[PDB]
Structures are given as C-alpha cells and as structure tokens.
Amino acid sequence: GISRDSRHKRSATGAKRAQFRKKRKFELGRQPANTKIGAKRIHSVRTRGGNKKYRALRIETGNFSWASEGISKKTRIAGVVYHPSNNELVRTNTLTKAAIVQIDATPFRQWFEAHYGQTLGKAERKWAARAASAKIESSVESQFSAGRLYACISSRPGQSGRCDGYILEGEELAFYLRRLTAKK
Amino acid sequence: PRAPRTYSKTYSTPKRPYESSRLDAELKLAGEFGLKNKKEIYRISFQLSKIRRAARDLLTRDEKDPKRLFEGNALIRRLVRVGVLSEDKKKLDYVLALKVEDFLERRLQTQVYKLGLAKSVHHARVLITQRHIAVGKQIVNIPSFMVRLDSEKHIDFAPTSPFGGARPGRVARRNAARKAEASGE
Amino acid sequence: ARGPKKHLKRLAAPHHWLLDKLSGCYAPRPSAGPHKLRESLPLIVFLRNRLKYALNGREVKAILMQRHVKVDGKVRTDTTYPAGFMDVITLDATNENFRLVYDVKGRFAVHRITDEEASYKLGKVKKVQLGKKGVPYVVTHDGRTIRYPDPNIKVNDTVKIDLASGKITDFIKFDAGKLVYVTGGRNLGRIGTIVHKERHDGGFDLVHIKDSLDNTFVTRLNNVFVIGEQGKPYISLPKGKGIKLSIAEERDRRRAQQ
RNA sequence: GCCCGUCGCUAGUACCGAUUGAAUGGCUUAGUGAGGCCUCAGGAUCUGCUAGCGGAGAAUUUGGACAAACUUGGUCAUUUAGAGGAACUAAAAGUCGUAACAAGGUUUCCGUAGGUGAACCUGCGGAAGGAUCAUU
RNA sequence: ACCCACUCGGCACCUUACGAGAAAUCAAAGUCUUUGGGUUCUGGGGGGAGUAUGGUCGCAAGGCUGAAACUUAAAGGAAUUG
RNA sequence: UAUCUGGUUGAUCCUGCCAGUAGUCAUAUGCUUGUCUCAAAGAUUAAGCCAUGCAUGUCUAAGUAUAAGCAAUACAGUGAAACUGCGAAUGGCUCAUUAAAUCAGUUAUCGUUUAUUUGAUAGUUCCCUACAUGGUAUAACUGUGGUAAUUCUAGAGCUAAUACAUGCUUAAAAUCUCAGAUGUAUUUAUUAGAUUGAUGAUUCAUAAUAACUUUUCGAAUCGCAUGGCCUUGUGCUGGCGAUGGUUCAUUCAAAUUUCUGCCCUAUCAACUUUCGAUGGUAGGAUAGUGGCCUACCAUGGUUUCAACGGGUAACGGGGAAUAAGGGUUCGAUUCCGGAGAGGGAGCCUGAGAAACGGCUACCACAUCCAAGGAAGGCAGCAGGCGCGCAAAUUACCCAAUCCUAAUUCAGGGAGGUAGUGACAAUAAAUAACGAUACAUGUAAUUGGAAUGAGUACAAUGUAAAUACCUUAACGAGGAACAAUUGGAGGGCAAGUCUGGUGCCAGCAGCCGCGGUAAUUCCAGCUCCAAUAGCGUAUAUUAAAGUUGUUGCAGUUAAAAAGCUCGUAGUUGAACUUUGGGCCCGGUUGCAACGGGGCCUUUCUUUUACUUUGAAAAAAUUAGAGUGUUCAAAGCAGGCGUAUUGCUCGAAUAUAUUAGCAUGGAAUAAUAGAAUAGGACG
RNA sequence: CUCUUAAGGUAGCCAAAUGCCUCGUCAUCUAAUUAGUGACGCGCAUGAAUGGAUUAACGAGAUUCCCACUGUCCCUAUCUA
Ligand SMILES: [Mg+2]
Ligand SMILES: [Mg+2]
Ligand SMILES: [Mg+2]
Ligand SMILES: [Mg+2]
Ligand SMILES: [Mg+2]
Ligand SMILES: [Mg+2]
Ligand SMILES: [Mg+2]
Ligand SMILES: [Mg+2]
Ligand SMILES: [Mg+2]
Ligand SMILES: [Mg+2]
Ligand SMILES: [Mg+2]
Ligand SMILES: [Mg+2]
Ligand SMILES: [Mg+2]
Ligand SMILES: [Mg+2]
Numbered sequence A: 001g002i003s004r005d006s007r008h009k010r011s012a013t014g015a016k017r018a019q020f021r022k023k024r025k026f027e028l029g030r031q032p033a034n035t036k037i038g039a040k041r042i043h044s045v046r047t048r049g050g051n052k053k054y055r056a057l058r059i060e061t062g063n064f065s066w067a068s069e070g071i072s073k074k075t076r077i078a079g080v081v082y083h084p085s086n087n088e089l090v091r092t093n094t095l096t097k098a099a100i101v102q103i104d105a106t107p108f109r110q111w112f113e114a115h116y117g118q119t120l121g122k123a124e125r126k127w128a129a130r131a132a133s134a135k136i137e138s139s140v141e142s143q144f145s146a147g148r149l150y151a152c153i154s155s156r157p158g159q160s161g162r163c164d165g166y167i168l169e170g171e172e173l174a175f176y177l178r179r180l181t182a183k184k
Numbered sequence B: 001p002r003a004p005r006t007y008s009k010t011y012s013t014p015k016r017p018y019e020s021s022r023l024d025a026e027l028k029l030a031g032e033f034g035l036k037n038k039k040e041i042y043r044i045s046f047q048l049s050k051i052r053r054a055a056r057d058l059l060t061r062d063e064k065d066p067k068r069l070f071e072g073n074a075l076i077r078r079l080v081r082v083g084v085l086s087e088d089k090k091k092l093d094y095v096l097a098l099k100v101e102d103f104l105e106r107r108l109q110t111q112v113y114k115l116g117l118a119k120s121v122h123h124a125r126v127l128i129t130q131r132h133i134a135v136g137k138q139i140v141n142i143p144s145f146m147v148r149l150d151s152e153k154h155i156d157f158a159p160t161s162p163f164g165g166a167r168p169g170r171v172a173r174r175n176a177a178r179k180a181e182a183s184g185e
Numbered sequence C: 001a002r003g004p005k006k007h008l009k010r011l012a013a014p015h016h017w018l019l020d021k022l023s024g025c026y027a028p029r030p031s032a033g034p035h036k037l038r039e040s041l042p043l044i045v046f047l048r049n050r051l052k053y054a055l056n057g058r059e060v061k062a063i064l065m066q067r068h069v070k071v072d073g074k075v076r077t078d079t080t081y082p083a084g085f086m087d088v089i090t091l092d093a094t095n096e097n098f099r100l101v102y103d104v105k106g107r108f109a110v111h112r113i114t115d116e117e118a119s120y121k122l123g124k125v126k127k128v129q130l131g132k133k134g135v136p137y138v139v140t141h142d143g144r145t146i147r148y149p150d151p152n153i154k155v156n157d158t159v160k161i162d163l164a165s166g167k168i169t170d171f172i173k174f175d176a177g178k179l180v181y182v183t184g185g186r187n188l189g190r191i192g193t194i195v196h197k198e199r200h201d202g203g204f205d206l207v208h209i210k211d212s213l214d215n216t217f218v219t220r221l222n223n224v225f226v227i228g229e230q231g232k233p234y235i236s237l238p239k240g241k242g243i244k245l246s247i248a249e250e251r252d253r254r255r256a257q258q
Numbered sequence D: 001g002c003c004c005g006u007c008g009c010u011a012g013u014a015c016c017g018a019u020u021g022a023a024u025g026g027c028u029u030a031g032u033g034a035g036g037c038c039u040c041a042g043g044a045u046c047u048g049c050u051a052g053c054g055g056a057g058a059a060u061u062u063g064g065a066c067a068a069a070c071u072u073g074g075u076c077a078u079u080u081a082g083a084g085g086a087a088c089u090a091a092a093a094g095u096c097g098u099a100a101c102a103a104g105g106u107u108u109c110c111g112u113a114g115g116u117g118a119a120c121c122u123g124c125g126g127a128a129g130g131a132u133c134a135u136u
Numbered sequence E: 001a002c003c004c005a006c007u008c009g010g011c012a013c014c015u016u017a018c019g020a021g022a023a024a025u026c027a028a029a030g031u032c033u034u035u036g037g038g039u040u041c042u043g044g045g046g047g048g049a050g051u052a053u054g055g056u057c058g059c060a061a062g063g064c065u066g067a068a069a070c071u072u073a074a075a076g077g078a079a080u081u082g
Numbered sequence F: 001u002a003u004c005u006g007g008u009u010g011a012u013c014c015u016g017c018c019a020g021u022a023g024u025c026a027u028a029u030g031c032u033u034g035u036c037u038c039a040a041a042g043a044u045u046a047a048g049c050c051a052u053g054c055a056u057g058u059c060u061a062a063g064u065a066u067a068a069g070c071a072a073u074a075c076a077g078u079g080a081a082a083c084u085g086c087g088a089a090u091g092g093c094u095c096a097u098u099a100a101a102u103c104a105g106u107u108a109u110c111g112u113u114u115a116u117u118u119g120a121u122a123g124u125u126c127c128c129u130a131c132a133u134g135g136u137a138u139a140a141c142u143g144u145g146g147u148a149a150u151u152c153u154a155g156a157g158c159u160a161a162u163a164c165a166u167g168c169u170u171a172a173a174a175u176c177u178c179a180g181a182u183g184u185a186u187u188u189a190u191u192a193g194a195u196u197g198a199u200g201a202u203u204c205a206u207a208a209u210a211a212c213u214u215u216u217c218g219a220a221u222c223g224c225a226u227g228g229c230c231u232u233g234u235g236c237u238g239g240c241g242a243u244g245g246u247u248c249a250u251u252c253a254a255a256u257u258u259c260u261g262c263c264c265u266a267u268c269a270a271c272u273u274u275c276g277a278u279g280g281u282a283g284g285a286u287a288g289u290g291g292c293c294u295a296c297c298a299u300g301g302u303u304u305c306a307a308c309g310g311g312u313a314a315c316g317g318g319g320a321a322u323a324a325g326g327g328u329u330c331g332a333u334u335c336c337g338g339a340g341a342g343g344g345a346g347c348c349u350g351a352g353a354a355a356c357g358g359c360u361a362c363c364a365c366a367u368c369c370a371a372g373g374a375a376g377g378c379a380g381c382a383g384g385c386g387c388g389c390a391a392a393u394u395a396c397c398c399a400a401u402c403c404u405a406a407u408u409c410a411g412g413g414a415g416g417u418a419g420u421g422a423c424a425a426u427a428a429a430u431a432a433c434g435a436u437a438c439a440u441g442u443a444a445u446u447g448g449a450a451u452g453a454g455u456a457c458a459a460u461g462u463a464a465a466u467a468c469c470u471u472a473a474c475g476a477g478g479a480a481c482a483a484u485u486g487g488a489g490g491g492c493a494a495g496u497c498u499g500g501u502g503c504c505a506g507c508a509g510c511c512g513c514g515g516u517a518a519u520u521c522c523a524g525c526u527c528c529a530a531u532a533g534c535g536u537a538u539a540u541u542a543a544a545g546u547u548g549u550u551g552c553a554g555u556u557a558a559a560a561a562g563c564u565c566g567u568a569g570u571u572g573a574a575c576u577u578u579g580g581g582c583c584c585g586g587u588u589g590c591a592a593c594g595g596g597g598c599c600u601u602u603c604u605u606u607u608a609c610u611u612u613g614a615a616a617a618a619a620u621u622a623g624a625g626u627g628u629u630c631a632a633a634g635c636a637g638g639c640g641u642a643u644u645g646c647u648c649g650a651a652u653a654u655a656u657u658a659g660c661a662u663g664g665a666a667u668a669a670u671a672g673a674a675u676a677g678g679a680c681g
Numbered sequence G: 001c002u003c004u005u006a007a008g009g010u011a012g013c014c015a016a017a018u019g020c021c022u023c024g025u026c027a028u029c030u031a032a033u034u035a036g037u038g039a040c041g042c043g044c045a046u047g048a049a050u051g052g053a054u055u056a057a058c059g060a061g062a063u064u065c066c067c068a069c070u071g072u073c074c075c076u077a078u079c080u081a
C-alpha cells in the first residue's frame, strides 16, 4: 500500500536508490478520510499496537470553543468557507484540521443570553456580577445577526473521528476575513 | 550450531626442506632421543619459537612493567617447573637462550632412560608405549610427557604392566602352558 | 525482524554468567522482568551453575515448581526469571538467603545473608515522577514504583525497600563521601566513596570513586549504586568488598595458602 | 657469425563486417490492466421491536490510491551467428631478396610525406645512441 | 679599450673525487638500508601494441586517451677478452 | 621465523622477470591409509527443479465436559473431539538483491508503538435481575448427504463460556451550576505549572475549567480451604490464590535517527528537478518525526575533498590466512545485524508479518483428474534430479541445551546421538632386549620377554545404544599383524651402479637430458626426503625493496610531459614568557628522575595534535591458573574421610577510525585594535 | 623467364544505369526470389575533369524490403447522380 519509507524518494544528492527490504507493514500509509458534512458515518481503523483510529466521514456536529469565555458548545457545521491548503476542499466541503467553517452559533447565542442577558443578536444579580465587561467584539457579535460563526477546525477528523474547533477572534478573525474578502 | 571447536597446529616445517646441516642435526636429535620422525623436532622448535617470541615481546617492555613482570614470572615459573629452565637462570634472558635439547631432555622417554628403567631411549619408548611406565599413580603411555621435576622422583613401573607388579604377563602364560606339555606331563 | 526474539544462543549470553562453551547451542534467555536481560541472572543459572543444587534444567524446574525458591518475597516459579542486583533469593528448604551482588570480577557472587536483614533490599531511584491524580512516585533500579515518597528523594539516590510491605523505610542521598557500588562497566563490582561528580549537561554525568585502598577511578553515573556512607554499608558486602587487587597481588594472595 | 621483411602451408587467438542480425536481463514513455485495501452504493435472508423501524448482513457495484503483469516502442548492458575482410602469435632447415649489427659495403636512428614484391628507398628538419670530444 | 683583484648572475670547462653508480661516468647522476626539505609527471619482463574499441580534436593526414585475448624465458643495460 | 637459490654471457657486473621454496579451518584430485581425541561437510556452477516422510502445536487445581469414552442423587477422577485462550512473527536455512544501501562503533526519541514479565493503579457505572440477564449461538455431538478427488463442506436438532452482547450493587466525605454534575478512557479550547515537582532544555509530568464521543475501562469469571459473629437463615462478614482488566512505570522488543568509516572504474563530469528534486506554509497519512503523500509557493540540493553513472564471480561486521615492522589477501559459512523464501505485488489475523511449512492475483514452472475441477512452493531436516572439479543417512532420541503452550507432564529434523567422512586439527603402532660368529656394527646363527591392531565374557558409557576408558579368555618370528608418497644432474637430500631405448619412447615447474659411453627416459639394486601421510592442479600469502608510507626506479636497463602559464590538491621564511630563584614533595637506589605552590613587571576565539579514563558483545588472538594420561583442547578443579563438607577459579591485555570525558599548549593552522565603530571606570 | 608497348589501367570501383557466359559464386532477405542488399573479381568491354570514389540535404527520377492502410485480389455485392 502507501509507503512512508525513504527507500524511494531519491537521496539528497539525486542518486536513485536501489530497492532493498520490500515494503514493510510498519511503514504503511492509508487513504485520506475526506470528511464531508452531514449524516455522521465514522469507521474504526485497527492501527498498530491494537489501537484504534476513527475515520470520520460526513460529520455534521462538532464541539467548538469560544475561548474568550470558555464555553465549548456542541454545534452544527454549516459549510467550509476557507482552507489554507487547497480550495478544492472548500469546494467539496471537506472537513479537516485548520479548515475555516461556519457553525450554527445558536447554542453560543443562547449561552450568552443565559449568562449575561445582553441581547447579542436578537439568578437576578448573577448578570450584575457578570458586569459591564460583557461586550465580546464588533466582529464576533456582528456574525450573530446572521447566526453563523466563523470557526477553525482544531481536531483531525480523519484521525480522531471528531470535528472540534474554536471560534476565530482578534487578529486571526481579521486575517481570515481579509482572506475571504480577497477571494470572494 | 554449537560453538566452534578451537584447535591449533603444534609444529612448523622448516623453510628450506633440503638443508644438509639441518637434516644432520635433526637426525642426531632423533637418534639421541629416540624420536619417531622429524615432526617431534618440529613441534619442539615450534614451542621454543612461541616461548622465544613471548619472552622477546616481554623484554621489549620497560623493566618493572606490570605486564612484563607478571607474564615473564609466569613463563619462568612454568619453565623451571617443567625443568627445561635451570634454577639459576630465572632472569627471562636465559629463557631466550633455551635450546631444543633442553625440552627433549624433560621428555618422559628421555627421563625413563636416564632413571635406569630402560637400557636405551628406544627401550624407554616401547616401554612407555606399552603402558609399562607410571608417572604417579597414573599410567602415562606417551613418550612426550614433560615431567614436572617432581614426578621425576615418582617415575616407576605401574602395578599392572608386569615389570613392577604381581602378574607374570601374557606371553609368559602361553610359554608356561607350552613348557608344561613339553615336559612330558 | 517480525517480532521479539525468544532464543538466546550460547556465546550471546552475558559473559558474567560463566556459562560452558560446549554445553549446548543455547543459553537461558532471561524472561521479561524487573532488571534487564544483560544485567540479570536467571534462576536456572543461579541454581544449576552457581549453587550446583540442580544438575539439569529439568531439576531446576522441579525445584521451582514446589514453591521452594523465592525472589524478593514472592515465589517466582519462572525458570528464567531475571533475578538481578540486590535481589534476595530465599529457599525455605536449605534455609539461607542470598543477596545477588557483584564480586570484584563483576560476576554475581554467591553471597549468603541472614534472615534478619534479608527482609529489606536497596534500590537506586531511577526517576521521580508525578503519577495519576497528582500522586508522586519513585521508580527504582529493579522496576519498582513506590507512591508518596519523601519530597527530598531525588534521582541517583538510594531507597531502602521493606520488600514485605514494599515501602520506603529510609533513603540515602547522592553526595560526596557516600558508599557506592559500581553496577556496570570496566569497574563493575567495585565499592568506594564518591569524590566528585562532574555534570556534563547533555552528555553523561561522571563520578569519581575512591576505594578503601585509595585507588580512584571515574565511571558513568548510570552504573553507580549508593549503598550507604563510608564504613557503614546498608547491606552486607561480598568477600572482597570491591577492592580490585592487581593481578600480581591476586597471585600473591592465591600463593599465601601453602 | 648474426640477422630482417613480403609471400606459401598448418594450428591457435582476437578484430572489422551487410544482415534496420539474434538472444537474455535492467530501466523506461504510452496503452491495457488482474488482485487485495479504502470508499460511493446495493440488499440475499437473518433475527429482534410495535402494515411500519431499527440491527447484522452475502452476492454484486461506483470512485480512488497501491499496483503484479501484458503489449508497443525506446534506451542501456551482457552473450552470440555471419559471407567476406584484415591482422597477430607458434611451429618452422618452405620461396625471394639481404634491410640492420664492421664506415654492414648508401653511417644508423627519430618525426613527417610520397613511392616500391618484400625487407625497404627517397625528400625535408632533427639526434649521436657516429665513423669526429680536436685547427688561437 | 686593456691589465690586476674581488664580487653577483650565466653558458661551459679541467682535476680530484669524501661521495654515488652495474659500469660507462656524475659537483651531481653526491648529502640513500646512517633510507623522510617541498612538489608534479612517468615505469613494473619481452612481444601482441601505441594495436582493437570507445571517446575527443583535425578538412585530411593524423593527434590525445588506450586495452584485452594470445604468446614467450629471456629481451635489455654497462663493461671484459677474443 | 628480519635468509633466499637456478635460468640471458666465452666469461663479468646489473636491470629484469620466469622458475624454484614455505604456509593456507583453501578447494579439488591421485596414490596410500593401522590406532585415540576432535568433526568441516551441495557455499562457489543452478536464490536451479523437486517424488516421499517429518520439521508447530499446546491443559493446569484454577475458561467451557451429559463422548450414548473409560474406569469402584450434578458431573466434582482421568480423559477423545470441539469451542475458547496462547503460540505459530521464535527457531532453522540461504546469501539472490543490496556500494552511504546493509553493517560497525557511537547518538536521539523533549519524535513513537510495545503482546508478555514485574511493580503500582480504578468506593463516582444506574433513568423494575444482581441470591447474577439474553441467544439475538453455535461448535463438538446426532442424523440426512453431494463430490473421481483436497485438512471441501450443506441442509436439519440441541447444548455452554474468561466466546458474543447487554447489564447493578460501593454508603460515607467532597466543590461548582441553577435538584444536577464533578472517576476514568477520547477530542478540542483555555488556565496554573513561579522563584507549587522534574529536565541541560519543553506547550514536560500533573492539576483545574468548559464542553465532546458510529462510545471505552470500571471481573455477571475459576480452583482449593472453609473460618468467624449472630436475629441459626437462601443470615452477615472474612483466606490463599488463578485468570481478566484501564492507565503509568519496567522489561522483552520494535521503528525511525546523530556523527564517522565501504572494493574497482573518468573508455562515467556534470547529476537531481515536467512524473518531488532541495526548502517553507497548511493539510492528509502514520504509532509517531519527516516530500512519506497532497495543494500553494520559492529555486533550490550534490559534485574533481570524485557527485552521478557503470562493474562486483560484493550480504556487512566479529574475524581467517600469511605476516620483523608496515602490509597483502580472504570472510557464502558455528556469533551479531540485514534481506529472502521461484519473481513480483497486494493483504487478513495478530502486540509484533507486507509472514509465505498464512491468504489473494499475475508471471514461470509444475502435480492429480472420472476433464467437471482441485491442489502447489525443501535457500528447514533427510533424500532425488540437474549442474558441475567440488560436498554425507529418505537413521535414533527428546537424555543434555533451551524454546513454545493452558504449561513440572505435551511438542520441537531447534537441538543432541550415531552412520558417511584422509576437510582440517591433537597424540603417535609398524618393534624392544639378550646369546653366539666375524670386523660398536654386521651376517634370514638362536633365545626368552612386552604389547596393542584386532575378537570378546561382563561392566562402564548411553534414552537405547555405538565408540572411548577398564578388562575374563584368545590375539607375533618373515613378529606376512610386510608404509606409503615423490625423488637421486643443478636449484635440492640422495648413484658418474647395471640392463634397456637411441633427438625414438619419454623426462623435464626452470636450466636442461635423450641423436649407441643416458649420473635426467623405461626398469632392477642401492640411497634420499617427509611419513599415516606424500604428490599434483588452481587461487592466495611470504619470499616481493617485482606496488616501495615505512621502502622502488626514471641519462644509457621500462620510465622526466616539447615548453611555459595555471585552478583544484599538496607544501610553504623567521619572530610574541625565556631565564632566574625559593619551598612542598612522589618513584628507583644521601643521589637521580618525575609534579605542584609562590614571587621575579605575570593569578575563559576556533581547530588539528597528543596523555589518561569510560567505550569498542561474546566467541577468536595473546595470556594467568589448572597432570584432558601428554597434547589439540576444556574451564575445570583441589584437600583430609567412611564427612551428613571446606575451598580457590572461569583473570588480564588488544583494538585508537569516528564519537565521549580529561591534562598539556611544543609543533601546524586560525582571530583580535588602523578611516579605532578599540580595551578598563 | 620470355615475347612485347608511347605507356602497358595506377589510386579507386564493380555481374554496378557498364559482365557476354549469367538466373556468375557466397551470405542475407522469403515457405519459395531471374528481384533487392552486402561481399568476391584473369573485369566479353570498370577507372580517374572523355573525370574516379564517396557524399549531408534535396527529387512528381529508377529500385528492394518493413509497418500502417485499404475491394488490387480472395469474390463479389449494394447505393447515388
Ligand atoms: Mg646490408
Ligand atoms: Mg648495396
Ligand atoms: Mg647501410
Ligand atoms: Mg611489461
Ligand atoms: Mg652491449
Ligand atoms: Mg613463483
Ligand atoms: Mg547453490
Ligand atoms: Mg529468524
Ligand atoms: Mg501535556
Ligand atoms: Mg506537516
Ligand atoms: Mg566482502
Ligand atoms: Mg551476491
Ligand atoms: Mg559473512
Ligand atoms: Mg555467492
């Protein structure tokens, strides 16, 4: 199968290497999961040592963390809008680490209302204790009017079977919005 | 498989096969010590060459060197114990001056003759080969034995081998059985 | 090559076992266990070659099957159980106890000890780590883990192990002027006191040892085993106490019995 | 005395050589491409739960990467056939001449060019390893 | 211009060689078995053979690089006497 | 044991090779072959092809027993088959591929997986069984069959688990959210992790918060004893274990990995990069790092210090032969590492395989067929064919060595034993002693002794043996119980012997002999050399100072480029703290030689080099000790008795490439401060 | 050796668009070849600016073979104007 050895991949001097030690199992590779969206389908791969990997194909929900307040709500993934490695993954809506996706944002809005009560996008003094330092950001909150949050996938869906991630903020959000407005 | 079995040659042939002086000296040694062939002389000269090389390598080292001291003392001890090296020559420089006759003298075939157990070196050879000689309480039927200078006072005939014991032999038995009939009765 | 090896050809066994060359093709492969493969001593070797009690491996197995042998308090019915340094071999039949220590020549000497001190053992602290749930523990030279150690115990220290409760009763620290055993290298089996410890960050730490005869030798930190303070060993030292007499002095001592 | 070459016979060795020669192996463009694996599906019949709804699931099947192998052509390397051609060596009392060694009877030799059955001859420049260490 | 003396550099020469060499001879061909100042190139018995082949240069003649099979007990150097 | 000799000539001295000479665990082969120990052995040509048989199975007390199997109120013992678990990835064989590949030494995993062993470790589980759940499960078994044929299997009826899938009991205490949750496993994000642990160093160990899981773990298991308390009940507690289990550590390992080191070749000088070549970013994949793969981007990476290419009758090393020193050659092969199982490729299970006595396909071979089909992999052990100059039994056994399994028990062509065996190696029979005659020796003038070569009672040896040792009896006079292989011109030890042949037959490594006077052929006699061995062929080593670093030669013997420039390479003028002096002090015999401390204007560039130390597996080598009877060997063994045993050993040195630690600062190189941008406050 | 010429065809080349014999002989090409090509040369009657030999490129020039291709053919049939 796919081999990760350096017996092929000719040497740094350019010399072609002769073939010894016909392909070894401990050097094997496997095919990409190419995680799609919707109708969760996770397969178990028996890996070395008797361990187990989870090839997530067609993942619909993931655990996304705000990271400004530490909520990490489970949400639905809408689609892929940006991918630094290949625009084809955006076109095919392929879930993978570091992919920029859109998430539902309704659990985050509900948590924000039940925690601060400050009408983000439209037990009495707990909100008073969570005092006027409650504005999140003019770019993290403007997405709530549309009910879609830009997030970066942090897990490896083809490796762990999960599609967790975090909501972009600050300079990362500014960079990714600049990329989006440059490519669209 | 099981570990290799170590084995070494015990002799070395001369470089020049047909040197008349060497042939005459070898024949002199073989005649004097009752040797079977030239291979025994070759073996003695090979042992002497090994000893000489060891002593030379030790003598190249500085005096009172630990390795030189230990190994030279051990070699001198072994040579005086076997009686090849005299008691007044424990210097490691008279080891180099050892000769083939010095080793050939400590042979059991030589010692049996020099102790009066045999009339000639060849008589000693056949007597040893025929199990007639015992070194201690042990029969030694090999002429090359290198008596250890303390077994020399113990070289005697065996309790068997009827020159130092009870039985009258094997050919004497048949001779007596024939003489009894030849007598008439 | 496709998996772990299970045979041990003769002439590939550690030379400190002093195995016969032509006894057979194979040597007893030390099973997995506490100490090591090279630094170990199989029970079959200890019983058939060091004590001569058993004549064959079948007889070694017969001895082991009746719970006679005991390593560090447990029966250890394994024919090739890797017994090693400071391990206590006790046989209830023929009741004497041995602490497996290194003689001056680096072999595992037969060192009879008494029951009143076979109870405990010494162990070099290989590592000090925080385990699950924030519980600190120490890993010793014999693969033992001991939870809740003294907060002053560091690496290269020695810990006395009860070996009945399996807990730390006392600990010696690594410092200049402490009695140390050499558990590997050329000086394997020597006993001395620490003179100095050169650090060599990144590389290997070196320690200078001075025996009672004032001989000073340097050795890697990996194979030094603190056994107490000078003149007060926490264990019973072997017959030679790791002196490393020169060959000439050894010959003199051999010839002093005539 | 020693001696050189052509030519002729015998034997052996290697070389050139039309045959777009032949065989073997390596690599490789292109084409086809088994098989397992991952994957898009598919549903025998198998059994549970209230006509429905889940679960296990063979045959089969989409697309992939891994790819043996085959075909085509190219290239490289190694063996090998071949009319004929052209040498070398050995054996030599063969044929022809006598080129060199004496100033070898034209001193020899080198480089180069031409010629001639053959050694060789001749021109040009060079060397003495010359037959001259030498004409104040 | 010439003479005398010295000097540096050069073409050489004569004698003697401590020395070197197989000798002829050599002030280097010496300072080498008492073997090492630095460095480049070339040779490994005589033929086959500076041939075949490949590469490369040339208009060509040819130049540079360059085998092998096979064959042979000598070939050769200096010197001595005839 | 630092050695030469014959051959060019009429004679000489050289160059120079040929030849001789000795060794070879170095292969054949010829002749010969009595004894004891030791034992290589189808590597070379064909990793060519294979008939047949065996080489991997395995059960304890402790997973599952209704064999209609055995035996004298559930079986409770043994135990077929089968299910389950484990192993089958070890071993053994071979060297085909492989030239920076393997491998060796030396590093790293702060870059990973790890069955098993050992140690530690889990009071947190549930949204109407726990005095214990289901078949959704079936094997063996019973019965009916099909096929010519295979370790082919179909339908039907059961039956269990430590198989498969579910599934509670653990209070007590505890902190947050607004009654619930907080164990552990997975994923993500965030925080602490200081100067409240560790490392040289971390985003480490660990802890915490918020959440997330096609959902893990949190014994519905088994044996032997049954004890104690009490409301004597299907009461309640409590032993030793076995097995299983999450995580960590450990061990056995594995996988990558730092640095340095490989034979010949330029009649290979440029190579790699379109189709990944060098690097960056991100992703995928992996157990994990990594162009390992993908997308984008950049144009890089190697090379005369030999890249790249080609060859190897190249697996690498430990090592072997030969060796004054330096070297030369070899290493398929008893150990270590690698690779492969006809050539490839793919893959299942499993911790571990790209496994081949596992599977799938293709290619090439090739087996049985009733022609429908089915089955293959001896470079395992024997054995056969073929190839060749070239290499053994279709034997016995698990007794040793160990290995595997559920495990003391079974299995093992692994291994050991024997058969074959002049591979090689060790010891050393074929005679010794008298009397008499002749001149110590000689002449088949005689005698009494000795022995094993054999054969064999018994015994030891052995798993059964066989052989060895030890021996009852036998078993020498031509002691016929008969030693051979090559020579006798020189090298080179030994005949101008006799007959034969007559440049013939032949010998002759070389020089040469033989053409009617043969010291050389063919023979007889005699003699020589080695000797149970000797000769021959090939290769290799020394000889060879004929490959020369040590250490060659170049005017004429082979060889100085026609000449000069010039890059790489090699080499490169001198100089910088020396010399006084006073002390303390080690080793060999008050003296010598070796260090350190103070002054005398004096208290952290970069290397090479060199000293010492760790390191360089074992085996092998040298070497200590040790009466295998000696010896090759082996690591044994030794010492007083009628023990109820004491004890020495299995050292040491060697690798100096490379890395590591360390002392020194001569030698060789390297840089300081010059438009001062300099050194100390 | 002769006879003999002004010289006696040199370097080359050839059964060639030049060779009668001749479909020369050998090899290759093919199942089969008076064809083609490569050789040989006592060449009826080759040959040196009446130019000899060889030539990259070029050619509606002559010729042989191979691949592809096809009604040229096996073996013809059909359709349109
Ligand atoms: Mg002439
Ligand atoms: Mg003339
Ligand atoms: Mg002339
Ligand atoms: Mg030559
Ligand atoms: Mg001359
Ligand atoms: Mg020779
Ligand atoms: Mg073979
Ligand atoms: Mg193996
Ligand atoms: Mg961490
Ligand atoms: Mg990456
Ligand atoms: Mg090799
Ligand atoms: Mg090979
Ligand atoms: Mg090898
Ligand atoms: Mg081979």
Ligand SMILES: [Mg+2]
Residues within 6 Å of the ligand: none
């Ligand atoms: Mg091996």
Ligand SMILES: [Mg+2]
Residues within 6 Å of the ligand: none
């Ligand atoms: Mg394999």
Ligand SMILES: [Mg+2]
Residues within 6 Å of the ligand: F342
């Ligand atoms: Mg085969």
Ligand SMILES: [Mg+2]
Residues within 6 Å of the ligand: F356
């Ligand atoms: Mg395979």
Ligand SMILES: [Mg+2]
Residues within 6 Å of the ligand: F357, F378
């Ligand atoms: Mg097989």
Ligand SMILES: [Mg+2]
Residues within 6 Å of the ligand: none
């Ligand atoms: Mg196998």
Ligand SMILES: [Mg+2]
Residues within 6 Å of the ligand: none
């Ligand atoms: Mg075999």
Ligand SMILES: [Mg+2]
Residues within 6 Å of the ligand: F430
């Ligand atoms: Mg005889």
Ligand SMILES: [Mg+2]
Residues within 6 Å of the ligand: none
């Ligand atoms: Mg006998």
Ligand SMILES: [Mg+2]
Residues within 6 Å of the ligand: none
């Ligand atoms: Mg004769």
Ligand SMILES: [Mg+2]
Residues within 6 Å of the ligand: none
């Ligand atoms: Mg002579």
Ligand SMILES: [Mg+2]
Residues within 6 Å of the ligand: F546, F552, F553
């Ligand atoms: Mg020479």
Ligand SMILES: [Mg+2]
Residues within 6 Å of the ligand: none
């Ligand atoms: Mg000349």
Ligand SMILES: [Mg+2]
Residues within 6 Å of the ligand: none
């Ligand atoms: Mg010359």
Ligand SMILES: [Mg+2]
Residues within 6 Å of the ligand: none
């Ligand atoms: Mg230069």
Ligand SMILES: [Mg+2]
Residues within 6 Å of the ligand: none
């Ligand atoms: Mg200088």
